[PDB]
């Protein structure tokens, strides 16, 4: 009987592929060939942040574009001031091997987790003035890879259990569970409207899920290796994914197929982080070659290179306003380029 | 803007306090030695953890040897896809890889060999030393002494293998048990010595689940590792 299901899945995949090919009347590269190239931009590090002991693994810019949060595997979550570089808070994490961090839009709460399979929340604006654990989400059966805040009460988290979870911080329970991924989920990305989110699960494929409906609304299978980075396009209709194959791939939610690919022959190492600028014209992807490549979102060419880090790049974040971009690496130093 | 300058001074004082905290902590961390305990499911790693300690995805065991703090981390309750999270333990002092030598037939020894090879060849682990604990030597001895579990039936090369000259057999141990032990050791030695030099080293130690001296061994190994990392400083 399993042969019937196998044949049904095969013919459904063939039909979906034929449909995607039928909608491929043109290609983004041939239409963008008329766009003026960005050329070259010599971005330099304007601020250097020092104080982290172990390799930094996660980072997330705040909506205020002033304070930033960085997590190191020494059990430390540091809040830095972008303008003055002064550390605001230094939360000691109960779990040393932290792998994710999220700065709430309002800045009242910050989430972080890791191999402990527990997502701890910390309130930065307690009446006492100190930072204390607010909630503990210990329902996951795997390491927390990435997390992002939808609001002051709802939070999406990705765990090594191959399933994402939307939690209500107030009750501390799984409000919704997203299942379907084959491998371990690595990164998360919240759309501008906070209604849909995408993520890769080490299966060379990404899945767009709806926060309210709680189901895999769409799926993409453009990549060829494990996906480690993902970020929504500023418009919310597309997103770029980075994989260990040393190539970034753009996918549109409406096209249901890959739009373009950014890669180069000399670039053979894996990818760790990817993000878009305010306008989305520049795609900044962090590579294991100790530098970050800024590609043109339309010309598919290397518009810039940030080779200021001496160790692997772990996280990369662009402010909502797009003034500067913070690139963290395993060297325990955060560099803000502008 | 006097208020702005006052806020800046307050933030500078807070940053100085945080720098002191990160300093009194740079001090506690570099003095502590982190270790990653790994091994097959059928291995006696649980017994070793129990002896050393006498829902969470990671368990921590803190123990002091010669006034030196060692934090051993077990990655239990985690999926068997280790290719991703293992990279998180690149800076650990050592990886205590416990393999059951008596678990050879499926053939779990082959799976342990493949896992050790993958760990030794992993890009981000090329600078991390691996302490190989060939655990459950009593079971291997009992099986090879009085038993029909012929090793050549699962390792044809064993038919041509002979005890080396540098072998230090235990007083009273049967020559066949020593031969099997040193063969299982060379099985990992061939893998560890072909893709490593001046980056990471393997420390094979014949141990048992109930042996306490294992702790000491780790300590010893740690010293070696550290010393060797110190020798690297003398290279301009």
């Amino acid at each position, epitope marked *: 009987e399993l042969d019937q299901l196998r044949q049904e899945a095969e013919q459904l995949k063939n039909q979906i592929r034929d449909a995607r090919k039928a909608c491929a009347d043109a290609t983004l590269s041939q239409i963008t060939n008329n766009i003026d190239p960005v050329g070259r931009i010599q971005m330099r590090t304007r601020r250097t942040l020092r104080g982290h002991l172990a390799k930094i693994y996660a980072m997330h810019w705040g909506t205020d574009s002033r304070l930033l949060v960085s997590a190191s595997q020494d059990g430390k979550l540091i809040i830095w001031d972008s303008y003055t570089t002064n550390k605001v808070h230094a939360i000691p994490l109960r779990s040393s091997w932290v792998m994710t961090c999220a700065y709430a839009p309002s800045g009242n709460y910050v989430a972080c987790g890791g191999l402990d399979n527990i997502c701890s929340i910390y309130n930065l604006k307690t009446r006492e003035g100190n930072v204390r654990v607010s909630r503990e989400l210990a329902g996951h059966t795997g390491y927390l890879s990435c997390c992002r805040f939808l609001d002051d009460n709802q939070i999406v988290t990705s765990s090594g259990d191959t399933t994402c979870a939307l939690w209500d911080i107030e009750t501390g329970q799984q409000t919704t569970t997203f299942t379907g991924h084959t491998g371990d989920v690595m990164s998360l990305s919240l759309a501008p409207d906070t209604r849909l989110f995408v993520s890769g699960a080490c299966d060379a494929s990404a899945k767009l899920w709806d926060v309210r409906e709680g189901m895999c609304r769409q799926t993409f299978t453009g990549h060829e*290796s*494990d996906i480690n980075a993902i970020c929504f396009f500023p418009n919310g209709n597309a997103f770029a994914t980075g994989s260990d194959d*040393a190539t970034c791939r753009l996918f549109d939610l409406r096209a249901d197929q890959e739009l373009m690919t950014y890669s180069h022959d000399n670039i*053979i190492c894996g990818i760790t982080s990817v993000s878009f600028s305010k306008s989305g014209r520049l795609l900044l992807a962090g590579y294991d070659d100790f530098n970050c490549n800024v590609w043109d979102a339309l010309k598919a060419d290397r518009a810039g290179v940030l080779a200021g880090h001496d160790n692997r790049v772990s996280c990369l974040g662009v402010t909502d306003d797009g003034m500067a971009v913070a690139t963290g690496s395993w060297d325990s130093f955060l560099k803000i380029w502008n | 803007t006097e208020d702005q300058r006052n806020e800046e001074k307050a933030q500078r004082e807070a940053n100085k306090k945080i720098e002191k905290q990160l300093q009194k902590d740079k001090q506690v961390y570099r003095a502590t030695h982190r270790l990653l305990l790994l091994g097959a499911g059928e291995s006696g790693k649980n017994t070793i953890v129990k002896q050393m300690r006498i829902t969470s995805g990671i368990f921590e065991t803190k123990f002091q040897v010669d006034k030196v703090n060692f934090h051993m981390f077990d990655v239990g309750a985690q999926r*068997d896809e280790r290719r991703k999270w293992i990279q998180c333990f690149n800076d650990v002092t050592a990886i205590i890889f416990v393999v059951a030598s008596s678990s050879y037939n499926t*053939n779990r020894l082959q799976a342990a060999l*493949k896992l050790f090879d*993958s760990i030794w060849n992993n890009k981000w682990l090329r600078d991390t030393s691996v302490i190989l604990f060939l655990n459950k030597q009593d079971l291997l001895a009992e099986k090879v002494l009085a038993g029909k579990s012929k090793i050549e039936d*699962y390792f044809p090369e064993f038919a041509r293998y002979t005890t080396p000259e540098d072998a230090t057999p235990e007083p009273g141990e049967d020559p066949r048990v020593t031969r099997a032990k040193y063969f299982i050791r060379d099985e990992f030695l061939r893998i560890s010595t072909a893709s490593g030099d001046g980056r990471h080293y393997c420390y094979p130690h014949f141990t048992c689940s109930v042996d306490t001296e294992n702790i000491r061994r780790v300590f010893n190994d740690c010293r070696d590792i550290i010393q060797r990392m110190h020798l690297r400083q003398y290279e301009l």
Partner: nanobody
Amino acid sequence: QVQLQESGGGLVQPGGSLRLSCAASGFTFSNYKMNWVRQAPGKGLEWVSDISQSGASISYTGSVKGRFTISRDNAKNTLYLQMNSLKPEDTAVYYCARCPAPFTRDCFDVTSTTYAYRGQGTQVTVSS
């Protein structure tokens, strides 16, 4: 999407010979190391053999050395496993596994859980 289609397996008597063939698609077959593993009835995944990218480095398990031959052809993205002499204990479902990442030699495809880069496998049975 990554796709691996195994075929060539079937019934055989003791001492027979088979030639399993795995057709790959959805990636650069030459940039990844290939492996053959097997799962016996009522048993876990067992690694059989491995062949590197260029096809120079080859390895087999102790119970397979000098009995099976692994090979690859990057000109068509295909893998081959010639079984010269089989035995009853060889009955199993054979799977073809690919290296997790390219330009690497550390494999973690022996995972018991569902591996995202393995084919459906081919059932081979040997009986007198």
